[PDB]
Design a protein around this ligand. Structure first.
Ligand SMILES: Nc1nc2c(ncn2[C@@H]2O[C@H](CO)[C@@H](O)[C@H]2OP(=O)(O)O)c(=O)[nH]1
Ligand SMILES: [Ca+2]
Length: 104
């Protein structure tokens, strides 16, 4: 079953964890990836009440199970922070425009 459902996409905790490890890794060395430069800051225009502290950084999570290294970032994101803590998993799918909704 799914630990996170982002629209059609099914993720296990192992998935979330692998994207989160890449994102904080790039984030530690001050390196980016893609034409949108992931990882980058997540502002929270949304207003989600994360259990975890600011500030946040987002990084694509791929439906393929592959870790993102460029190309289409897809619709799903993993939100973490300076402490390497999972804030949550969000998605543009089902969200109006470039808005985000949370993965269930
Ligand atoms: N909706 C939303 N987009 C954000 C936020 N912070 C950064 N963004 C990025 O800014 C774009 C539009 O403002 C979004 O598509 C998103 O890029 P990503 O597609 O890389 O997530 C945020 O808090 N909310
Ligand atoms: Ca998987």
């Amino acid at each position: 079953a799914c630990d996170y459902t982002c629209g059609s996409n099914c993720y296990s905790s192992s998935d979330v964890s692998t994207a989160q490890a890449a994102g904080y890794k790039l984030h530690e060395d001050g390196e980016t990836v893609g034409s949108n430069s992931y990882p980058h800051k997540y502002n929270n225009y949304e207003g989600f009440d994360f259990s975890v502290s600011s500030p946040y950084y987002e990084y694509p999570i791929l439906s393929s199970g592959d870790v993102y290294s460029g190309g289409s970032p897809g619709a799903d994101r993993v939100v973490f922070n300076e402490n390497n803590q999972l804030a949550g998993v969000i998605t543009h799918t089902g969200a109006s425009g470039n808005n985000f909704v949370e993965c269930t």
